[PDB]
Amino acid sequence: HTLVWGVWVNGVDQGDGRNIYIRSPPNNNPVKNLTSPDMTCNVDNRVVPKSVPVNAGDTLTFEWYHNTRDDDIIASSHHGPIAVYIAPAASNGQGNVWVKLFEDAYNVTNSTWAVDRLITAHGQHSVVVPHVAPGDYLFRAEIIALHEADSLYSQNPIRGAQFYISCAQITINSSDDSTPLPAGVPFPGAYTDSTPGIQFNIYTTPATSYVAPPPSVWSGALGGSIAQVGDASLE
Numbered sequence: 001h002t003l004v005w006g007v008w009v010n011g012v013d014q015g016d017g018r019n020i021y022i023r024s025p026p027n028n029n030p031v032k033n034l035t036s037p038d039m040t041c042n043v044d045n046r047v048v049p050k051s052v053p054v055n056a057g058d059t060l061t062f063e064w065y066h067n068t069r070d071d072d073i074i075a076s077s078h079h080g081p082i083a084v085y086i087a088p089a090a091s092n093g094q095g096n097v098w099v100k101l102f103e104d105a106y107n108v109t110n111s112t113w114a115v116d117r118l119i120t121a122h123g124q125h126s127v128v129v130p131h132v133a134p135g136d137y138l139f140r141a142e143i144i145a146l147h148e149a150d151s152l153y154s155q156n157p158i159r160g161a162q163f164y165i166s167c168a169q170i171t172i173n174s175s176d177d178s179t180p181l182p183a184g185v186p187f188p189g190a191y192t193d194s195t196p197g198i199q200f201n202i203y204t205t206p207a208t209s210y211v212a213p214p215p216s217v218w219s220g221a222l223g224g225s226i227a228q229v230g231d232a233s234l235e
Ligand SMILES: *[C@@H]1O[C@H](CO)[C@@H](O)[C@H](O)[C@H]1NC(C)=O
Pocket: 033, 034, 035, 036, 037, 157
């Protein structure tokens, strides 16, 4: 159970984005239904009044929280991977539009899941803004908690992989469009019950065996990291 508070650009806090430049749902409940329109940008997908200006090569940092800003972020039980996707805003995230800019699942050196490192990072994870066409974009940040992912939601709706999905409205101003955005995957649609990484038993299967859901990260990406860029407590 987690939500996005706002974003940072190049290490500078853009301010509370909830229902402003983040298409925020009303609470931190997970999405579980892989076929639901809620997989696109969570349960209250609508245009919000602001879009954060960035340029290609900027660092865009999502900042998550549980109940209050810079708290425990997400329950430690929620081990799983983190991804970020981009699509053009004109799509409203419909169709084959979502391109992967970032993937982190399990780090063998540190023996940590992406979520574990997100807590240590005070909720902060980043991508580098790609050289796509200037214009309006949706950046879709996605945490998958696997603590009940031994079951499939489609079979047992009280269990399943949990998706914490947040869309940010991002305007790319300065870009040479040298890496134009390639075809995307649909959400809902890309993840199915047979997709690697959707059904997994984190209690019996070694984390080193985990494979995150495709698609792979676009070669055009520059992203990106799970790491604290800024100190929310100094505000
Ligand atoms: C899952 O989503 C689909 C598509 O909106 C819907 O038809 C189905 O009823 C949903 N399942 C549950 C259990 O609500």
